[PDB]
Amino acid sequence: FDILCVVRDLVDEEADERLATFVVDSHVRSHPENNARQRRLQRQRKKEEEISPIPQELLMKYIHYART
Amino acid sequence: RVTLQEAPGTVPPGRLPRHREVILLADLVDVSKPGEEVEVTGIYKNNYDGNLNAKNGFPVFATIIEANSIKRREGNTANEGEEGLDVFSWTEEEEREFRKISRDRGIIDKIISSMAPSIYGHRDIKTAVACSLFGGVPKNVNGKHSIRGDINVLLLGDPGTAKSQILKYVEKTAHRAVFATGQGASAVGLTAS
Amino acid sequence: KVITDQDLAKIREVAAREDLYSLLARSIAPSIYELEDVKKGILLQLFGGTNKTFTKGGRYRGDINILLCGDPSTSKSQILQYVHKITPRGVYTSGKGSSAVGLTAYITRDVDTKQLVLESGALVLSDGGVCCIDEFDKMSDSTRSVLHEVMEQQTISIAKAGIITTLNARSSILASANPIGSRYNPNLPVTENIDLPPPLLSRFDLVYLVLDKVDEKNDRELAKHLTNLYDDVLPVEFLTMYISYAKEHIHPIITEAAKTELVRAYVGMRKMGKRITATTRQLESMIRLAEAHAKMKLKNVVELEDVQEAVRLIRSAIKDY
Amino acid sequence: SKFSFGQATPRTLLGIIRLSQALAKLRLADMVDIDDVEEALRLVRVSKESLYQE
Amino acid sequence: SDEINELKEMVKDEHIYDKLVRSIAPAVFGHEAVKKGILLQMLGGVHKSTVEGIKLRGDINICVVGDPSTSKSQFLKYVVGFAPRSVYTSGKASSAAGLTAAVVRDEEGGDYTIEAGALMLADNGICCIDEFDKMDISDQVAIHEAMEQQTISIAKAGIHATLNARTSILAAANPVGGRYNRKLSLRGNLNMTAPIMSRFDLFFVILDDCNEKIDTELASHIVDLHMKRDEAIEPPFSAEQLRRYIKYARTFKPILTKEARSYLVEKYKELRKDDAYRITVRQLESMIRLSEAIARANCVDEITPSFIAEAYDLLRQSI
Ligand SMILES: Nc1ncnc2c1ncn2[C@@H]1O[C@H](COP(=O)(O)OP(=O)(O)OP(=O)(O)O)[C@@H](O)[C@H]1O
Ligand SMILES: Nc1ncnc2c1ncn2[C@@H]1O[C@H](COP(=O)(O)OP(=O)(O)OP(=O)(O)O)[C@@H](O)[C@H]1O
Ligand SMILES: Nc1ncnc2c1ncn2[C@@H]1O[C@H](COP(=O)(O)OP(=O)(O)O)[C@@H](O)[C@H]1O
Ligand SMILES: [Mg+2]
Numbered sequence: 019f020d021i022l023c024v025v026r027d028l029v030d031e032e033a034d035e036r037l038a039t040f041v042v043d044s045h046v047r048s049h050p051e052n053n054a055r056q057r058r059l060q061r062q063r064k065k066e067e068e069i070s071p072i073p074q075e076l077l078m079k080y081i082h083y084a085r086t
Numbered sequence: 087r088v089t090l091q092e093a094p095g096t097v098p099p100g101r102l103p104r105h106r107e108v109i110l111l112a113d114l115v116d117v118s119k120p121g122e123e124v125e126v127t128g129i130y131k132n133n134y135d136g137n138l139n140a141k142n143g144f145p146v147f148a149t150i151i152e153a154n155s156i157k158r159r160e161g162n163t164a165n166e167g168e169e170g171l172d173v174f175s176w177t178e179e180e181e182r183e184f185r186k187i188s189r190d191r192g193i194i195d196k197i198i199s200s201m202a203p204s205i206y207g208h209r210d211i212k213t214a215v216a217c218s219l220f221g222g223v224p225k226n227v228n229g230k231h232s233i234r235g236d237i238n239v240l241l242l243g244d245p246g247t248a249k250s251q252i253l254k255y256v257e258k259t260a261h262r263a264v265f266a267t268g269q270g271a272s273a274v275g276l277t278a279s
Numbered sequence: 280k281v282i283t284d285q286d287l288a289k290i291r292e293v294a295a296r297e298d299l300y301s302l303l304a305r306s307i308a309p310s311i312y313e314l315e316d317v318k319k320g321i322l323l324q325l326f327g328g329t330n331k332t333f334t335k336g337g338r339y340r341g342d343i344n345i346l347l348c349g350d351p352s353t354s355k356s357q358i359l360q361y362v363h364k365i366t367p368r369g370v371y372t373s374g375k376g377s378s379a380v381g382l383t384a385y386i387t388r389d390v391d392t393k394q395l396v397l398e399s400g401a402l403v404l405s406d407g408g409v410c411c412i413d414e415f416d417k418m419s420d421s422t423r424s425v426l427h428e429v430m431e432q433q434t435i436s437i438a439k440a441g442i443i444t445t446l447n448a449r450s451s452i453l454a455s456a457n458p459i460g461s462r463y464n465p466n467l468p469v470t471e472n473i474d475l476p477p478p479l480l481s482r483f484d485l486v487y488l489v490l491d492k493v494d495e496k497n498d499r500e501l502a503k504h505l506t507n508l509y510d511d512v513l514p515v516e517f518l519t520m521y522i523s524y525a526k527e528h529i530h531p532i533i534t535e536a537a538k539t540e541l542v543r544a545y546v547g548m549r550k551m552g553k554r555i556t557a558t559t560r561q562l563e564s565m566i567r568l569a570e571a572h573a574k575m576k577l578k579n580v581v582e583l584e585d586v587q588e589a590v591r592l593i594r595s596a597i598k599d600y
Numbered sequence: 601s602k603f604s605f606g607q608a609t610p611r612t613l614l615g616i617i618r619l620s621q622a623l624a625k626l627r628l629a630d631m632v633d634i635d636d637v638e639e640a641l642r643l644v645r646v647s648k649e650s651l652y653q654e
Numbered sequence: 655s656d657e658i659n660e661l662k663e664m665v666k667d668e669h670i671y672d673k674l675v676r677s678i679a680p681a682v683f684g685h686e687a688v689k690k691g692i693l694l695q696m697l698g699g700v701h702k703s704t705v706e707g708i709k710l711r712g713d714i715n716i717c718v719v720g721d722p723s724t725s726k727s728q729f730l731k732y733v734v735g736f737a738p739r740s741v742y743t744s745g746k747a748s749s750a751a752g753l754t755a756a757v758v759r760d761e762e763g764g765d766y767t768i769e770a771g772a773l774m775l776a777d778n779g780i781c782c783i784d785e786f787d788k789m790d791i792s793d794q795v796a797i798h799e800a801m802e803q804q805t806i807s808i809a810k811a812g813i814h815a816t817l818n819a820r821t822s823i824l825a826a827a828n829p830v831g832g833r834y835n836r837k838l839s840l841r842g843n844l845n846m847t848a849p850i851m852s853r854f855d856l857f858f859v860i861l862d863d864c865n866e867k868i869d870t871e872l873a874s875h876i877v878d879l880h881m882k883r884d885e886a887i888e889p890p891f892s893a894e895q896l897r898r899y900i901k902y903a904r905t906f907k908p909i910l911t912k913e914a915r916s917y918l919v920e921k922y923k924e925l926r927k928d929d930a931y932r933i934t935v936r937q938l939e940s941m942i943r944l945s946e947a948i949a950r951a952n953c954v955d956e957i958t959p960s961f962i963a964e965a966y967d968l969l970r971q972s973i
């Protein structure tokens with residue numbers, strides 16, 4: 019194994035607060051309720067922009083191109 | 087010719103699968119490999135079968151599919167929202183966009199930050215995942231020495247530290263991915279049998 | 280190849296007899312000597328309790344299960360053979376036995392016809408009757424799980440070969456067991472001797488420990504009986520017909536006096552023991568036994584006598600336990 | 601003690617009467633005699649105990 | 655039209671929430687705490703998927719521990735015969751399939767084939783396991799992915815597949831000893847390990863007392879069940895009414911308000927502090943799941959802090 023990543027779960031006020039806030043925000047963001055196809059794509063892009071600097075599909079294409 | 091069978095995921099639980107025979111003409115051959123999950127666009131055709139009639143006792147016609155297009159659905163359940171036969175293929179404009187993105191100084195930081203955006207932290211598990219996804223360059227020195235060019239990663243952590251979600255994201259992003267569980271995998275289910 | 284009005288009159292005349300219980304107990308096992316309690320329990324199991332089909336509640340089983348464990352010298356398989364000869368419906372099986380058809384439903388191939396056929400097991404074929412299992416000790420894990428499911432849900436479910444079906448198995452069980460060694464050791468508890476899971480052993484309403492203790496008087500009397508083999512008794516056919524009629528027509532119902540007696544008996548049994556002398560299962564078992572006893576007398580009402588008889592049979596088995 | 605093969609049971613009885621009946625058949629005399637029963641008992645003893653004690 | 659009027663009448667009731675709890679498994683006596691858990695499990699939580707294909711579970715798992723003869727099985731029996739999709743099984747499964755999937759090959763030529771399991775068959779339903787404390791090793795490892803990832807992954811000779819297992823597990827287990835030892839903690843009384851214990855949203859413990867009054871009350875109730883038959887059971891709402899209302903509630907998809915979000919973070923912080931290891935990140939989502947289910951019971955599309963508080967008590971009771 020080239021890289022080993024050990025993950026520890028420790029109780030910390032600041033870390034717990036930040037993680038809980040992010041998890042709650044993500045859960046609210048993914049709520050199903052929260053041209054027509056173009057409008058859907060635009061709202062999906064707006065939702066994605068919050069948490070990722072690069073579009074996911076563009077990222078997959080980038081990875082494939084770089085590998086090939 | 088291939089034997090198309092209902093995928094385990096879509097068949098009702100505990101019921102026998104149904105199958106059809108798909109005919110692949112020129113330029114379509116070898117595109118689908120056994121054990122894969124594919125979506126087949128074709129023509130639904132029927133023909134007279136004597137043995138069928140004989141066996142059934144009724145005038146029943148055999149059925150086949152003449153493949154028009156094949157889309158590799160294996161490991162692409164979460165990518166069904168896109169369009170095109172291949173979602174990992176690119177156009178010339180997209181290649182220019184890739185070059186423009188790459189020329190940026192902070193490309194690596196953005197790439198790492200874009201790995202599993204829904205997972206809060208673990209910037210050390212995202213860096214390793216990105217490195218594994220991109221991989222290295224295999225080498226063959228003078229045709230005698232072979233050096234591996236892939237990166238393996240192991241996550242040894244606490245029960246609720248978002249490891250399975252990371253694996254699922256890697257499966258979604260990778261061009262060809264396979265997911266297996268601990269005891270669900272046999273010594274020859276991996277490798278070859 | 281090599282029920283009438285008179286039959287009903289004869290049945291009613293027999294029922295009117297005062298010593299009907301003893302007569303039936305004797306007629307069940309003429310050749311078995313000095314096992315009155317076991318014979319009474321077997322009779323009550325044969326008659327069975329009342330099946331309740333509840334709206335809002337579900338299904339409450341009226342069957343009675345009896346376990347015949349103890350020393351190998353005593354007669355235990357002959358009792359099962361007699362029960363088979365008497366019960367209108369039932370099958371004979373031994374755990375881990377290739378000769379028997381099987382205890383669980385399975386999917387097989389019809390050699391004759393080269394066709395796929397779903398064959399029902401012994402428990403399914405015993406629906407509404409008594410299933411006698413000769414050798415409970417040696418049994419497959421799978422078979423034990425099937426037995427647990429049958430005694431819990433009363434249905435067998437199979438989801439193999441592309442078939443998803445559930446088969447009714449509303450049948451009573453009368454199993455026999457032997458100790459781990461050459462004899463049953465009184466010092467150790469019953470659970471250790473019988474070598475069965477505590478869960479599966481706690482589902483039998485009545486548990487009988489027939490032990491061949493070496494007693495001069497008992498040995499002499501048994502020898503006299505056996506050598507002589509070389510109180511009226513009813514024919515087997517009439518007994519089977521009587522059981523069939525009682526199980527088909529009579530349906531007893533609990534009354535206020537029966538309710539009071541049952542509540543008082545359960546409270547008293549609980550107060551005996553901290554050690555738990557009895558559980559709620561010991562109340563449903565008493566209810567079933569009282570209903571079966573009422574069935575035996577061709578009564579549509581459960582009275583105080585039936586409850587008194589039930590508490591006594593249940594208590595004697597608990598005392599062994 | 602642990603030396604005994606097993607406790608006598610009514611099965612041992614039935615076997616004893618079976619052996620006595622077989623010996624009577626051998627004798628060609630209808631009535632089973634005490635000698636036949638004694639012979640069966642001694643056969644039962646010498647089948648196991650005779651060699652075990654050695 | 656008549657049914658609609660009944661539906662509107664039920665939601666108009668002020669004490670609707672209490673009545674539903676009291677109308678679950680009326681045969682069982684004096685176990686309102688367990689009934690509330692089963693009702694919430696049936697309603698379930700909103701299933702959500704992130705913007706990159708990561709799935710967030712929305713099903714509630716309940717484990718019931720109790721001494722023998724405590725109506726543990728009765729709860730599973732009622733759920734089996736009431737919920738639309740459900741399967742009754744036991745940890746010591748007879749079938750080669752078991753809880754999870756298994757592979758069977760017709761002898762010779764014929765290739766390996768997939769045989770459905772308990773969890774598979776109960777897809778989009780509730781799988782009731784009679785004895786969770788006796789599951790096979792294979793199943794114990796296998797059930798790790800099913801309870802959280804909602805999938806079953808198999809890679810055997812010539813066959814590889816991912817099987818949907820979107821089910822809610824309602825399991826009943828016995829204490830490791832003969833009876834529940836109050837002195838020891840819940841972890842000690844249970845053979846379950848930390849990973850599995852975290853995947854369960856709620857825990858319920860049923861004890862066996864010996865008080866005369868309790869025994870008399872329980873003993874009489876059972877007798878009247880056989881005596882009065884259906885007349886003995888008079889729940890506020892019949893099975894048909896409850897079934898229709900539950901289906902109506904599942905249509906709602908409540909959201910989290912701004913006040914609830916801030917309150918939600920604070921409660922998780924307090925819960926983690928007391929732990930310092932039953933508490934983890936999975937419990938933060940469990941409160942979200944329970945909060946949605948409680949909102950559905952009230953037929954309300956916005957989760958208020960009061961609903962969040964109610965979820966907090968239920969998790970604390972499990973500790
Ligand atoms: N009360 C009794 N009356 C008559 N015979 C009896 C009695 N008790 C024991 N026996 C005799 O004991 C022998 C027991 O035979 P049986 O076939 O019932 O054994 P079993 O219980 O199946 O034995 P094992 O556990 O060794 O398999 C029979 O010969 C039976 O005659
Ligand atoms: N609170 C109760 N109300 C009514 N009946 C009860 C109650 N508690 C126990 N019982 C009775 O207990 C009997 C036996 O219990 P049940 O079959 O539900 O499983 P259990 O013994 O608790 O579980 P297990 O099989 O895991 O030991 C049931 O028939 C039920 O009538
Ligand atoms: N760092 C994190 N950021 C966001 N969500 C998290 C994080 N850690 C855990 N979670 C949540 O908790 C759950 C963890 O389950 P999972 O990671 O599948 O278990 P395991 O770690 O055993 O594979 C996930 O559903 C995930 O949404
Ligand atoms: Mg995991």
Ligand SMILES: [Mg+2]
Nearest residue numbers: 355356413455
């Ligand atoms: Mg026998």
Ligand SMILES: [Mg+2]
Nearest residue numbers: 726727784826
């Ligand atoms: Mg149970």
